[PDB]
Every structure is written in structure tokens, then in C-alpha cells.
Design a protein around this ligand. Sequence first.
Ligand SMILES: [Cl-]
Lengths: 576, 576
Amino acid sequence: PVEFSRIVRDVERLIAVEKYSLQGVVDGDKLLVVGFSEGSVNAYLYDGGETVKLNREPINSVLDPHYGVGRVILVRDVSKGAEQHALFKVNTSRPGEEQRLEAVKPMRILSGVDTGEAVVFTGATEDRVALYALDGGLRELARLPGFGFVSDIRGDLIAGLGFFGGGRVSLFTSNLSSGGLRVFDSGEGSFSSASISPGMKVTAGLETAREARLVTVDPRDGSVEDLELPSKDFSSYRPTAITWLGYLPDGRLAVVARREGRSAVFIDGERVEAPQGNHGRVVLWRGKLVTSHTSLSTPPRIVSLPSGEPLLEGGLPEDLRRSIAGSRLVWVESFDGSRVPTYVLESGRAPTPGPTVVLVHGGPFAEDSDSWDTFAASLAAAGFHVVMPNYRGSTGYGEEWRLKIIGDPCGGELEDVSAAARWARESGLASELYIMGYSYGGYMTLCALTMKPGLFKAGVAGASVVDWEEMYELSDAAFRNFIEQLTGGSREIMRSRSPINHVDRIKEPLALIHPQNASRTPLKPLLRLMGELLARGKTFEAHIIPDAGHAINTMEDAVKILLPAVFFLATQRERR
Amino acid sequence: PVEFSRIVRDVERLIAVEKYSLQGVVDGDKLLVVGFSEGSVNAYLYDGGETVKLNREPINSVLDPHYGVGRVILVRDVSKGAEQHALFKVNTSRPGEEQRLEAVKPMRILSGVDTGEAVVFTGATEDRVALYALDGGGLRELARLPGFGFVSDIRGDLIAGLGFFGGGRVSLFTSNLSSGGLRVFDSGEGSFSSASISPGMKVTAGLETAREARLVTVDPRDGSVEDLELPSKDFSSYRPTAITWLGYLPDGRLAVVARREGRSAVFIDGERVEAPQGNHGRVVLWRGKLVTSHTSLSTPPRIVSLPSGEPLLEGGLPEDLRRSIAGSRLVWVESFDGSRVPTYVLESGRAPTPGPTVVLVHGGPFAEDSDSWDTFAASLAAAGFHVVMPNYRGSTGYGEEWRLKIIGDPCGGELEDVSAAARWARESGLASELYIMGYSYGGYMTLCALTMKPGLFKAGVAGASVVDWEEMYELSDAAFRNFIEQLTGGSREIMRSRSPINHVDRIKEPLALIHPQNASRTPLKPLLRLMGELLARGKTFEAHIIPDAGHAINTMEDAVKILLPAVFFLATQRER
Ligand SMILES: [Cl-]
């Protein structure tokens, strides 16, 4: 008999843990860290093993400080839950006292750095996106041709990143005193990060269709060339993504790069030991390195390097923490000999072999990595091993692997998902196999239960795609484009790869979780799918909920969209 | 912000409390009680202080013992909840040791009584219902019955019982233990409800009518009936409408438990004995004193000593939860036509006065809200809601006239009654906000109220609701179709105009639908169409469609499926 209250209690703890993020170093060597709990945000000083809350009421975020500045600039929603924001200054010697910056009209704050003498940010208004600087008074440094974000300032030079068309992130620069704008593209791909050398070049991370590298950009003559670093651990790591980079007050370049779902920290190209997982920015604090850290078993936290010992971390009970027994990355051989990179979270509450869920990510253009995942942790806590396959279409493994999905939905990617199920059983992890996913994952659950009955014992399909053909006609102009690219632009492909048209072949119980009022995950198709299931003798359950929303941060969100899935699987587990 | 885990925890305690029932006196003057917890049944000797568990693995029930027998006959499902039972003997001197009564083929055991020497019972096989006897000489069919039948008492060779032998009433039957046969008597006034055999070997039965109930003696030889005069007149003055149970105690005095207006009363030889307010079960003489079982809207079933009302056996609820369910009373609500609607109220110790109140409408419609333990009402009170339970016209328990007013007027008079109770809630100063919630005919009432009377309730929960009468006929079985034509007068104008699917436009409040996926008498197709109408007409709702909803809530799983969605939804509306 399922332990309903124990599951709810555990899920709540998992939702409620403080998660931390690192923002910089202010005042007299204090960490500026942001703390989240159920997506309520607050800003804190950390030094000498104590914290002090900077804000009063919750905020949205904080603008990046230069090292040492004696104030923090809070960013907060003007009306309740809206896209509009106000800016509020807090002196780090007077924590809790907020002065609104009346010179900023309410607007959508996109990014910002505070030099201590000027606050430079990007915002979007009814009509436009701009680069502002505030001190003098307010000032428009440049109108931007699209959403854009400030990466760093040094002296007068300002460096940033922008979605200015072409399908790729451009680098831009401005000047603090003379304003103006200058945009740099890379044919190869996208700029992902930027910081300004002491020699007044812009060091940037360039992601490509294969591997990432560091370029140097001379802002005055437009010239680019590759940056060679004294130590070569960085080029030898062969990264596919560059999360963040920045020059430290001593002059050294800190870089955090990624490969295969995890990241690594470099200083002037030299690797520095960090706990396994994913990292955020790196700062120099009291002479040592500090960074944030997350993983499939660790909510986001602030650790020191290279000991990896935490400074600030959320609390979980030890049984519950033991229930998440370890995660490895494994490469699963699929139908065509391609290897599917797949994260596995083993559960401390299941035997080996034991109950396993293939938890299929959404998108499809997204990535299962070694980062904290509420769903995965909740399943582990409920006695399920969790298998997370990066099916073709996923991001994080190069452009080639992402593009194989184009024109073959419910084709190659499904074989990948399937290959992971099979690997689960054959390695002797899995005794029983279940499938569960939201968005494109829901679609995969529906495809698997129709195109491959007998593989999974039951499935959970949330926010699933049901019929591609129908979904176009009841869709907006932008999403419609998306659907035609993904389907090659053919009715035979949209019809044959929609699982509503294959409902007859189902032989396993299905759980449907769906929003009642999302325009891009529409209800009318689901109604029809339920009609087909009823009319054809198939057994299922359904939960239709308003304001499903985007992600899960609060316990309410979990009760609506996560607990039905976990309860259904726990119940099926006793039907063996 | 809703306290989800506190609700789940409270509800689980409420589902899990041992609920007691009294069966008889066995052994050396020990009580035989059966205990229910999470739909698990066990049998116990109580003899002052500690209980002793007679069975091993759970059971389904026990057959009724004569005073003093030194054994107990357990009845248990032989298969996985098929209605296939075997009988098991336990000597009272040696609890936990079972001997299976192998002479009896597995069959549906409907009832039994054990004299110490013979075990006499009825059961239902593939083809028939019979009356069996089992002694040292083997098993014998005494009589095959014309319908479902139940043994009530034995004395010497004379067996009395009760049976659904047609004519839309319950008949009295007798047999002989030695020579079998069958005799069947019935009344043009109504139904027999209970039987016991007098010292002189006449059958005393309780006869329920279109109005008031009375005690009769039947001479099983002439078929001659007459009224039983008792020596105290309390019983006739009490003017009962139902007789739950009656029995002759070892001293020859007649105990009778009788009901009027949602509550019952104990009588010994006509004389009323003081008892805790609510409803009571059988009555016995234990160690020279009176003992009976007791339940109310604020007390789970328990064993109590009379006349003090001190509890002998009773389940522990924690103190906070205990206080949340703060007392019930009965009130008479004036309705649209001057008729008074008898209405139970359970106030919450977690609500102010005035405060959030749910009008919790009973199913049926031929059923009754009495002062008896109700998991739904108790959960709502635990979650901070006052609960109003109105016996709308159509209800049973208040005479045949009040039950028949619903015939040909669904979503008519009865709805005004439900509505009247809402209004009384506010006007008396109980309610600050009003909600409606019901299952079966109660779901229909929620749907009717939200369409025919928007602005009255702030939100509603409609579970297992009737949606469209017209459609429900065409997809219903022969017996249920009859029911629908009676209830609707046999007119298409009435079936169409009183189905709330046809009035979906007038809804202005949030609706929660809970519904089974695979119940043939609460079919899904209509609900799917109702959702279509709500989507297509801008209306906001949630829905939960669950397989195997089943009939009642006994296990925590049942509550998770069908109760928690309601409570959670109502708690959320209470903040918005
Ligand atoms: Cl804190």
C-alpha cells in the first residue's frame, strides 16, 4: 500500500529547500548571494559565517555589482506577477532600507551591472529595447535591435550579448560616456559570455556546431582571434558550451565550461577541482575561490574551491537525502549505432533490479544534465530509479545530434528513448519499466504506448502533443512555423506520427495531466484523445488543471502536476 | 497558502481510526467486537482493559453468536476480493488458531448465526440463494430462497430472517433447523426491518411504513399478525420512523433500537435508556450492564456503556484533529413552499463564525443525511469548513410523502431545498462564504445549482454527477433506464430542461469535476461532452477522471482519488 502522506511530506521538503545562487562580492569582502525557496527570492550578504538579508519584501533579482561596491541594486515586480519592474538601492551598511530609483520609469529589466558610480542596464518598453545608464540622471546609451544583456563594464567600455537576428547571439559594445553601439557576429555560431581584459579587449565564449572556444575581440577595429591560455587544461577539456567567464581582481581569467551535462572551472586555463555537477560564476573571496554548485543529488548551493566544502546549503533530512543514492552518466547504444547520453539517478529506496522510470525531457530542444531536478528527486524518494535519455533532438551534444529530429518525430528519437528503457533492463537496474514526460516528453509517452506496447508497464503523459495536424489549425503564427519545420512540411508525417491516430494499439494504463487553459498546449485535442480511449476500451486517468504554468516551484504547483504522476506510478507498482 | 500536507495527514488519520461495531457476548462474558481500519477488518474479544485479536489475517466479517458460545466463525474473502467466502472457526479459549469449515464450498456468504451447535447461514452461488445448516452431521440446504435473504435469529429449531422476495418491500421468513422448509409473510403497510424470537417462540418484528414504525408479533403458524404491547410507553411516544434492530436479552426482556429524525434511541421493554446522542447499533447485557455501539457526525463508531455513555472501546484521534470537529446539531430549514427541510450541521473548530461553509449534498437521491460518522464531513471540518447537510425532498428518513415529492421534478423542489439551506447558513450567521459539493445525485445538484442559481455559491465540486438525463438513458442498462423514466415523469421536455449540460451558459463560478472513467451507471461520455461545452463557452473548471472510483471511501487510496481533490480545490478557492 502506497505511502501517500510520506510521499507528500518528502515532495514538500524537496520543493521547499533553499537553493542559492552566487552573484558577486560587495563592500568589505562579502558574498552577494541570492536565496530561493518555492521561487520566493531574497538577497543576502554572507561573511564570517553569518548572513544578512538586504531586501525587505521578495524581489526578482539583483544587478551584478563590481567587486567592492557598497550598495546593491534590487530588481522587483511593479505590479503582482507582471513583466514590469522597479529598481531599488540598498546600502550594504544599512541592510533592509530600500530607496526606489524614481528616475527609472517602470519597465522590463533585462540585465544590469552597477559600477558603484553608474548603474548600466538594459530594459524593454512598450515600443523598444535600450541600453541605459543611471547616476547625470538617466540616459539612453543606445537603442538595441532586440532583446540584449549587459555582460561587463570596465572603465568606459561596456560589453554585452544580444538576440539581434540571424539565429545566433551577437556580441555588442558601448561606451559609458559616449553611448553608441557596435555589434559583432560569428558565422560559426553564438556568443555565450563575455568579459573585458585589462588590456581593453573583450574576451568571449563562442559556441559552435561542435565545440566551444575563447575568442578575443578588439572593440575598436573589429578584429577577432583565438585566445591561447598559459595552461592547456581548458582546450584539452573539449567543451561544448561556455557558461560564464570573468576577470578576477588579481587579473586572472576564470572560465566555467561544460561538456556532457557537467561543467568544470578553469583559471588561466588550469583546471581547479570542483564538486561534480554544474557550476555558476566564480569569485575571489578573502583570497579563495567560491562558486555555486548543483547536481542531480544536490540543490544549488555555494561552495569553496578546491575543497568543494559548502558555505551555504539547503537542508534535507538524511533518510530523504539517502534516497537519492547516486547518479552516473551512461552512453546507450541505439538502433542505428548512435550512442544516447543518458543520466541515471539510482534510488536508495529500490532494489537492484527494481522499479525504474524513463523520465523523458521536454522541448524537444533541451537537455537532461547533472543538475537538480525536482521530478527526478521525487521519483527517487518514492522508490523509483530514474533514467533520463538525451534523445536525438536534445541540446548539449552538438548541432548534428540536435538536427536529426527534424522531419522524424516519433521516429529516431523514440528508438533512442526505447533503447534507454532496454538498457535499463539489460544492465540489471530495471525490474519494471515506466515512462513519464511533459511537453515533448508527454508526446513521447503517448508515442511509446502506441508504437511500442509491451515495452512499458504504464505511462504518464503531461502537457503532451496529441495531434500535429489539429494543433496547427488551433495555433498562433510563430508556433505554427515551428510545427512545419519539425514535421518536414507534410500531412502524411503530421498524421502518421500523431498518436491519436494509433490509439487502437494501446495495451497499458495511461495517466494524462494537462492544462485547461494554455494556448500552446491546447485542451481540445486532449478531449478528443480521451473520447478515442473511452470509445476503444482503453483504461486511463486524467487531470485537467488551470494555470498549469511553466515550471514547478511551489507546493501548489507540485500538487497539481507532480503528485498525480508519482501517485499513479506508485499505485501501478503494486499492480505487479 | 493551503496546508496540503496537514490536510493529507488529517484525512489519513480520519480514514485510519479504528471504528468499532458490537456483535454479541461470547465465552466467559467477554464482548465480541469487530474493528475496521482502512477497510481492514479484524475480530476481537474485549473483557475489560485489553482486546484480544481472534483472527490472524484480515477478515470480512463474523457470524452472530448466541450468548456465551465458546467459538467464533470468521468470514473471509478466499480470493482477492471476489465475493467468494470461506468460513473459519476460532475457539474463544485459543485466539489466533483458525480451523477452516471445509464442508462449505466457497460462495457469497450473506449472513449467519451460530448456536454453539449449528451454524446457520445464507449464501449466493452462481445460480441461487439458499439457507444452510452445518452441525456435526455435515452440511444441509434447509431452504432455497426466492431472492436475497438474511438470517436474523434462531431459538430451538425456529429460524427467523428477512428477505428481498419481491413486491418492493422486505418479507419475513422462517424455517426449521431440523425439517427445513420455508414460510414467508409480508405486509401491505411496508417492510420488515428486523426480527427476534420471543421466549414463547413467536417472532417479534419491526415494521416500517409510509409514516411511522411499529412493533408486531407474528404467529408463524396462522400467519396471524398483531401489535406488540410493551409495558412502558416510551417507545410508542417516541414515534419512531425506523427500527434498526431488536433482540431478546438472556433475561427475556426486549431491547429495541429505533430511529427518528437522523438519530436513534435505546429501549428495554418499552422503557427508554439514556444514550449518547447520535445513532446506535445492537444492544447487549454485559457483566450485568447495558452496552451498545455508537456513532455520530462527530464520533467515529465506538462501544459505549449505558446509561453513563462512557466509552469501552474507541479509536484515538489526536487532540487538535479531535477539536477541529466541534459538534453537530439538527436544524429545520424553511424552504420555498413552507416545507421544513431537516438539515444536519457539523461546525468546525477551525473556522470562525461566520466562516467558510460547504453545503455537502447527499447522493441517491433516495438516501439520508443522519447524525452518523461521515468521512467527507469530518475532512471538511478538519480543513476549516463548516458543513451543512440538507435532507432535500426525495431524501429517505422522514416518511414516504417527503421521499415522493422529487418524482417528476428533478432540479425543481429539491434544489430549492438545497438552496434554502445555503441561505439559512448565511442568515443564521454560520456562513461567510458558501460552497456546494456532492457526489452521485449530489454532483447533479452541484451542476444544477451552478447553472440554475449562479451567484449563490462561490465554487462547486461535482463528483459522479448526472449530466444529461436524455443521453444517460440511451447509454444505460434496462433496470437503470426504468429508474430514470420514473424519476423524470417519462417526458423528453423534463429530461432535456433539467439536465445542466443544456444550461452551461449561465455558469459564473469555478467548478471541479471528479468522475469515474469506467462506471457503467455514471458513464464518462456525457462528462466529456460537458467539458467540451465548458471549454467552448469560456468557463473555468478542473476535472479528475479516475478508474475504479468504486462505491465508498475506505482506504487512503480511495481518499486520494476522490476526496482530496475536492478538499484541496475548496481550500484553494477559500484564498482566492
Ligand atoms: Cl537564510
